[PDB]
Design a protein around this nucleic acid. Structure first.
Ligand code: NA
Ligand code: NA
Ligand code: NA
Ligand code: NA
Lengths: 166, 167
DNA sequence: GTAGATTCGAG
DNA sequence: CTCGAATCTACA
């Protein structure tokens, strides 16, 4: 069972405005979670321009320390540029897989943003209502679609995908 | 006064088979020097295909040690990828300027080899007689012309050029 | 800001 | 063919 994970932050240095996940089991996306989170610092304008989460939206929410355990219990954590998410988030009890590194191995000499791989691979997922790109959950559905494409293209197992990641 | 320094070697680790300089004063190139040098090691065939200098050509020349004293005493040294010359040559006083770095900053988005720049900047230089590309002295005049173009175009002072190089 | 992959000069 | 410093990329 693979658990795509994504996080919106106050900026590049860290802070979480949101976290979301979906699970990939048997080539199907299931079990979506998402949480707006009260960050440990101000939300930089550059980052708000991007995810458009405001201070008022996260002011009555829980600290990351108190939300993160809702995401425990997967063997495998997948993320696009997983190094980012593994740095800004607290310690996750599981192994990491990076869809960015796997997309490069598979398809050399292209662009490797979450969203560029989506279009280049001509992917389609159902994405939840009320949630635009660069929200934790939306982007989860994107990164999960991408994983499924990577698994259907290579036959790589979770364990192999982690080996390539590390 | 800026002294352009260039060096032909045995490989990309070092060993000196040739050295040469010219001096650039008020946009004019003067005081050319060059020496063939006996290297502290074998001339690899990879280097030899470039500079064209055989073992027999430098078998009874002086070692770098006996010859580097002619080159000392400038306040400023200039070389194309000075990193390289600085590494393979004996330690040199004065301040270093790197034309590769200056070209990168002045003209982003092109090639930065001595000879690429020579062509793109459409340089004209008076080269020495009976030499060719990758003969220390020959390359000096190329790198000197590029420096004089870089200075005319940017108006950078030496101190500004040393800053850009990385003091 | 980050850390890793890629590039590009010198002989 | 060697190998670094400089230049990209992804992430918010
Ligand atoms: Na992300
Ligand atoms: Na995102
Ligand atoms: Na040189
Ligand atoms: Na040369």
């Amino acid at each position: 069972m693979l658990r795509i994970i994504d996080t919106e932050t106050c900026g590049l240095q860290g802070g979480i405005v949101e976290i979301a996940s979906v699970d990939v089991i048997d080539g199907k996306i299931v079990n979506p979670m998402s949480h707006l989170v009260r960050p440990d610092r101000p939300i930089s304008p550059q980052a708000m321009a991007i995810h458009r989460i405001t201070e008022a939206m996260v002011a009555d929410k829980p600290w990351i320390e108190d939300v993160i355990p809702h995401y425990y219990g997967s063997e495998w954590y997948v993320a696009h540029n997983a190094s980012f998410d593994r740095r800004v988030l607290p310690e996750m009890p599981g192994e990491w897989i990076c869809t960015m590194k796997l997309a490069r191995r598979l398809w050399p000499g292209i662009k490797y943003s979450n969203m560029a791989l989506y279009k280049t691979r001509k992917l389609n997922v159902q994405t939840p209502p009320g949630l635009h790109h660069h929200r934790a959950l939306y982007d989860c559905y994107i990164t999960a679609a991408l994983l499924i494409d990577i698994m259907n293209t290579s036959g790589w197992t979770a364990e192999q995908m982690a080996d390539i990641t590390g």
